[PDB]
Amino acid sequence: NSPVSVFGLGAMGTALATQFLRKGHKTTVWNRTPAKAQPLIAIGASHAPTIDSAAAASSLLIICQLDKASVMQTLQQAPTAWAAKTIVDLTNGTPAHARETADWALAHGARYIHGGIMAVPFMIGQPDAMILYSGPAEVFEGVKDTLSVLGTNTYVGEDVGLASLHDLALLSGMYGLFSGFTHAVALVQSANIPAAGFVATQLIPWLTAMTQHLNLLATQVDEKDYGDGGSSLDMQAKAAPNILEASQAQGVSVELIQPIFKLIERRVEEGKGSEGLAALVGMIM
Amino acid sequence: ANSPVSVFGLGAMGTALATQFLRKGHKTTVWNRTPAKAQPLIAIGASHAPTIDSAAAASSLLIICQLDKASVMQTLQQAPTAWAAKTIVDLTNGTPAHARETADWALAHGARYIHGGIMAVPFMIGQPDAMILYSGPAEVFEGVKDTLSVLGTNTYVGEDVGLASLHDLALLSGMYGLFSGFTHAVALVQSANIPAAGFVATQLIPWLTAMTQHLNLLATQVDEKDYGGGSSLDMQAKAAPNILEASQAQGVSVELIQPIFKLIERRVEEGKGSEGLAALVGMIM
Ligand SMILES: NC(=O)[C@H]1C=CCN([C@@H]2O[C@H](COP(=O)(O)OP(=O)(O)OC[C@H]3O[C@@H](n4cnc5c(N)ncnc54)[C@H](OP(=O)(O)O)[C@@H]3O)[C@@H](O)[C@H]2O)C1
């Protein structure tokens, strides 16, 4: 099957190479440090001794390194190696990082798309694994069938920085969820209530219900029509002080939840207490 | 001809409660400070009480769903002889202390008293995924739980009359985390003119659903006071600058998510970067 090369053999790059081998692709691997190659040599990979050698083995080149700086250090070490190849860069970073990297690649005669892996290394290979892609549509089309070995492809558009924007937005969502878990569990723990049962039987079911409610809020964001949905900001601005006061009586810091309470209060002070929660998005933009 | 009930407060939530009692065949008497809000309920079979006194005299099970504890006290103190030998079920949002203060007054005026927390928005009332928490004397709860089971799934959480409110405010803080995450993520995609609806339905919800299951493992680690490799705080502390920098380039404020990033960084500086997210709970206690 179609050869592939993988540059960077940390946790995610190891899993990517492993899955290409499992599906029968001739897989060439490279890493700054040689030791991380050995688990992949053990299951049939070729270890390339140089960046040049890895680039010559395949026309599809996958880069999965620490950061954009490291990607640039790899590219600049063999600047004639990239011509007429397709580079698929799965290295985490900002939208700007992806645009800057694409500029260099184009100037050196390569084709370039950026991807964001929304998945833990163990999930690689499963349909559960969402991988976002951005950059020129024709470049993606030319390699998507091979890339579909790693997970479910989701192309998100032409601007090569979009996959990173989507990735970082999803991670922001997760950091909010974790903020809520932390505050809720601290409050019950302050009254010597075990965390396990509370989370399994009360917090997860409640978060599941409100996670579905997010589709209503998203519709209201698009329509710029911030109806209350039966839960007005005026009413919420009376429950939030109670959450703060009980937290303080229990000795629990309010640092993780006070920001959104100040937003809710600001909207009431603008005269729009009869709206609902979809109004907050525009306030931080 | 089912067991009579009285409902005090006909805002969005109180309207839904009264509606459900009528739908299930109960003689339902209703009262509101602003009397016009009774008319949609008279239209579906309710009796409108002209006074607090008359609403209290119509039933033995008396439900109050107004705004805050101050409002409940204003209602109680207007007819101090009306409450004797009744069961008051107070579903009005407040702190644990508010529930204890209210119960003291009720007991002194010859009433029985339970406090509850409605974990549902109005349209959810009557469906299986509506959870209502209850606390106070177990025999008082026993006397009315079958009637109350019309609103949702009863969850008794103990005898201290303040416990339902502690549980309620903890679950609400969980939800405000989730909503902080939605708000930041949708602002990021909206800053690049991406519709909220498709992103939320096909990318954000499935991601949040996966990460929600991970919360069981974190809760176990909280109980065992044993945190963690896994996803070490050290790695998380590498995603955060990418999210902050991309937010700044897009003109999106970081006020909703910066707190958790600062907590994480404090734990790394204590020498415990190899621990996991469950360590955060103890830090805010
Ligand atoms: N909606 C949701 O998503 C629910 C989520 C879980 C439960 N949650 C709680 O349940 C109650 C009622 O909420 P609702 O949305 O109905 O509030 P409003 O629509 O603003 O109605 C407030 C009511 O409180 C009364 N209220 C307000 N102040 C008073 C006083 N002082 N005395 C008596 N009654 C009072 C007011 O009477 P009014 O219509 O303004 O005349 C209304 O009947 C409140 O404590 C909420 O925190 C709500």
Author numbering:
A (entry chain B): 3 to 287
B (entry chain A): 2 to 229, 231 to 287
From the study:
The NADPH-dependent imine reductase from Ajellomyces dermatitidis (AdRedAm) catalyzes the reductive amination of certain ketones with amine donors supplied in an equimolar ratio. The two AdRedAm monomers associate to form a dimer in which reciprocal domain sharing results in the formation of a large active-site cleft between the N-terminal domain of one monomer and the C-terminal domain of its partner. One of them, AdRedAm from Ajellomyces dermatitidis, has been reported to be more stable than AspRedAm and thus perhaps more suitable for process applications.
The first form, which belongs to space group P3121 and was refined to 2.01 Å resolution, features two molecules (one dimer) in the asymmetric unit in complex with the redox-inactive cofactor NADPH4. Using data set 1, the structure of AdRedAm was solved using the structure of AspRedAm (sequence identity of 54%) as a model. The structure was built and refined using iterative cycles of building in Coot and refinement in REFMAC. This data set yielded two molecules in the asymmetric unit as a dimer, which is the canonical form of previously described imine reductases. Electron density for the backbone atoms was largely complete throughout the length of both chains from Ala2 to Lys288. Interestingly, the other active site featured no cofactor density. A comparison of monomers with and without NADPH4 showed that the side chain of Asn94 was rotated approximately 180° to accommodate the ribose of the cofactor, but that the orientation of the other side chains was largely conserved. The AdRedAm dimer observed in the structure from data set 1 was already instructive in showing two possible states of the monomer in which the non-natural cofactor molecule was either absent or bound.
